[PDB]
Design an enzyme around this catalytic site. Structure first.
Site, short mmCIF file in Angstrom:
data_model
loop_
_atom_site.label_atom_id
_atom_site.label_comp_id
_atom_site.label_asym_id
_atom_site.label_seq_id
_atom_site.Cartn_x
_atom_site.Cartn_y
_atom_site.Cartn_z
N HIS A 61 0.84 -1.20 0.17
CA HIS A 61 0.01 -0.05 -0.02
C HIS A 61 0.82 1.38 -0.11
CE1 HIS A 61 0.28 1.21 4.18
NE2 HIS A 61 0.17 -0.10 4.36
N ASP A 167 5.95 1.36 7.16
CA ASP A 167 4.83 0.86 6.90
C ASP A 167 3.88 2.00 6.08
OD1 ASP A 167 2.12 -0.15 6.86
OD2 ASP A 167 1.61 0.77 8.75
N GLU A 199 -5.28 1.48 2.19
CA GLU A 199 -5.02 0.51 2.93
C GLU A 199 -5.50 0.66 4.33
OE1 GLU A 199 -2.80 -0.55 5.41
OE2 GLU A 199 -3.41 -2.66 5.64
N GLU A 200 -5.18 1.88 4.93
CA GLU A 200 -5.15 2.31 6.32
C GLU A 200 -6.57 2.43 6.75
OE1 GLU A 200 -2.83 1.70 8.20
OE2 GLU A 200 -0.87 2.01 7.54
N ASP A 222 3.68 -6.21 3.55
CA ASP A 222 3.11 -5.12 4.62
C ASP A 222 4.04 -5.42 6.01
OD1 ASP A 222 1.80 -3.29 5.93
OD2 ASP A 222 -0.08 -3.97 5.57
N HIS A 301 3.46 2.55 13.31
CA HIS A 301 2.55 3.77 13.34
C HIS A 301 2.90 4.74 14.24
CE1 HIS A 301 -1.51 2.11 11.47
NE2 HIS A 301 -0.44 1.74 10.72
CO CO Z 1 0.93 -1.38 6.30
CO CO Z 2 -0.27 0.56 8.79
#
Ligand code: CO
Ligand code: CO
Ligand code: CO
Ligand code: CO
Ligand code: CO
Ligand code: CO
Lengths: 326, 326, 326
Positions: A61, A167, A199-200, A222, A301
């Site tokens: 992503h 990420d 994607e998130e 991922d 994150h």
């Molecule tokens: Co991800």
């Molecule tokens: Co993520």
């Protein structure tokens, strides 16, 4: 460009869910002289190698988590909404880049000095861009512009990279690499590379992709959140990880076994485990054998999310072997 | 073989979500002589009767809730994560069967004696398998093996059965009974029997099935949690129950009427009500008319879940009648 | 005729405090052909070996913890009282055997499903036996009947046994074993073997025995709760344990020394430590040198209480040596 250098370049490009343009562009810039490509109505970037039956789909992503500007205040500050999962503790006292149609502007989410005891929620926070009034602010920024954190880029003890957006910009980098390494080889059936959007926020690009494509095998490339008692003996530096089970899916045990076998065949150190969250691959549990493949990532994150460069190098090797042998 | 014994047979077999092998193999063994069957790439077992348009689909799931081994501790205990919904209160001080490739091993989740106040959450619990070290435990069990409770089987006062797995092994047995009874009968068009996978983790087997079948009517045969002020006048022993509404769906009211009408015309006592949870039938609410048909079950999702044999008998008769007359 | 089979046989027999008949009857069956015995007015089973002065008393208890039926509700469920120490957390969602004058019935203590947080107190629980009313229930069960858990039996990695009732059915078996191994030998004085009643409700059987016997040495053969910071380095597998102090007594130190010494003399591995609870030996602190001898048990007073078979093997050798040499 070394791997460190590629990670720096792709992590620095701003693009939250729904606003992936700048990342797509750059992927186009360095794939175009190698392979043809198309762009979805939702914004996925797809590259197909080989011909015939769709054998394998690899998905990484393009979106990162961030802030959506919802409005401007009388004092000229920006109110915002979170896009994707972000701990409120990470919003407080931070520089941001505010991305607008005209260009990019410095912003600042403040903190209150000791001179002048709890976690301030996102809805009580604003972005200061140095405007003195609503009118001055509306000249620089509009509702539905967006913001992402400014990003320090660090290398720890020569082996680890820490920076916001690993990420899944590591996944983007990995697929690009695989594409270049594979274009000149002859492949059985089609192997599809897709750089997905949104994607998130619920795998929106992936689900779109799922009409349009019907692969025998569907992989997400991922993160794998590490480490804790849930993650068993998965460790940074011990190789790429089969993400066998997360909150979105129990993935195909048949496919995990094949991957594991192909890695061993090739002398590729490999790990397997359980973690939290979901991947694009779960959008295909519908029709294909699905699996997620990762490098383990610490502090996921945040501005300090960290990967081990060796795991990534091995991940690229593994992805190529799967294209050949799966 | 009585219904008691058929229920005990199928409930004693271990198979959590994604790990349904042992149930599917036994169902095939039981159905092999009577009809052809196919196995999905996700593991659904499908049995078609008749020819023509797809009139009726019946789904009953093979997976039960249970535990997924995530890791091994330094003292050779097994760490785990839950699969499907389980009240943590039910994990403490219990015997388990840990299922591995090399076979099935005894395990125990301990309890702390008074000698040495609150519910101990799942992540603070471990399985003891009699290993003295991480090394010795790895020889026996691996991450991504699974565990399930040892299962007492009780018969209450002649008419109630109590054991883990009635949900949804009662439904498995019901459908097998229906196949055996309908295979030597002309009834068209097509009546499809699916034994589904991964119902307990978001109806994944059924969502996959939905991409390959397009029936006029789609039924789930599953539990109806009872009883409470939510479930009105539904009582065990008063017959099969139409599960008209739950947390996953408001099912087809016209389908419920037809079923109601067919039941009454065949002199089958029948009930209707609201309960909690979801069923496989909801994976078809975007394409078919859907309904869930159940027996009422007390103490659902525990070792003492209970059904009334006579409701089961009548559900079998109802399912056959629907095959003929719907 | 393995030790494991004997443990299983004796653990499976139902008998709470005050209701030890079935256990006493089976012990009588096993020693009938070997020695004479008397049953006193409270229920103790006593076997005397030798002639002369009362030198040694060995006590192991026949009663287990369980439930006493106190009454029957309008809806035909069984209300109950606890007998002996049971954590309320272990009552919820369990199969039981209800023991009546007429026979053994299946029973269930329910659990409320998520579909319809705290420990539910014993007084808020009832047993379901599948009666439709008070009337039907009273035909099946009466107040002052009792119930025990249904009992799984597990062997862990070949060397550990787990099941409810090892406390103190392991001691019962240990004493039977010793009686067989000593009857064809000439001892000094008398060695008295007693299977007591009502140990779990304040040592009532042993208190009764203490008015009929005055041994120089009084031994309880009973569990030793393990393992915690309180129990030092006592561990399962490292041999029988001298329970030197518990909550009921500081036992005879010189007697501990003697046992220690006779153990080493025989190359018998042995441990000593502190634990919680009380034993039958405490009833003789009035008049005799007292000690308690154990195997360490994990998860005491639950369905998964666990012992190491070697510890039990050694305890039997120790008891026999004590009969010869003490
Ligand atoms: Co991800
Ligand atoms: Co993520
Ligand atoms: Co269920
Ligand atoms: Co179910
Ligand atoms: Co006890
Ligand atoms: Co005891």
């Amino acid at each position: 460009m070394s791997m460190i250098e590629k990670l720096k370049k792709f992590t620095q490009i701003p693009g939250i869910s729904g606003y992936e343009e700048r990342i797509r562009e750059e992927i186009i810039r360095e794939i175009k002289d190698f392979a043809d490509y198309k762009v979805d109505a939702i914004g996925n970037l797809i590259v197909e190698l080989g011909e015939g039956e769709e054998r394998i789909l690899f998905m990484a992503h393009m979106d990162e988590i961030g802030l959506l500007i919802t409005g401007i205040t009388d004092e000229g500050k920006l109110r915002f909404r979170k896009v994707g999962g972000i701990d409120d503790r990470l919003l407080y006292g931070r520089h941001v880049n505010v991305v607008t149609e005209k260009g990019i502007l410095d912003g600042v989410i403040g903190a209150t000095p000791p001179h002048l005891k709890s976690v301030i929620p996102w809805y009580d926070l604003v972005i200061d861009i140095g405007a003195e009034s609503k009118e001055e602010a509306l000249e620089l920024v509009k509702p539905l512009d967006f913001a992402v954190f400014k990003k320090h880029f660090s290398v720890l003890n020569g082996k680890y990279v820490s920076t916001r957006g690993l990420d899944d910009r590591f996944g983007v980098v990995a697929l690009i690499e695989a594409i270049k390494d594979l274009v000149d080889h002859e492949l059985e059936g089609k192997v599809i590379f897709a750089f997905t959007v949104q994607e998130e926020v619920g795998l929106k690009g992936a689900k779109f992709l799922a009409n349009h494509y019907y692969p025998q095998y569907a992989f997400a490339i991922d993160s794998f959140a590490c480490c804790s008692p849930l993650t068993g003996d998965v460790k940074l530096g011990k190789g790429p990880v089969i993400r066998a089970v997360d909150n979105s899916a129990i993935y195909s045990r048949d496919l995990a076994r094949k991957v594991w076998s192909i890695a061993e065949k090739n002398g590729i150190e490999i790990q397997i485990g359980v973690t939290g969250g979901g991947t694009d691959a779960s959008a295909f549990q519908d029709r294909s054998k699905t699996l997620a493949l990762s490098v383990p990532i610490k502090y996921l994150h945040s501005e300090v999310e960290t990967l081990h460069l060796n795991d990534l190098e091995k991940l690229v090797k593994l992805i190529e072997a799967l294209a050949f042998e799966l």
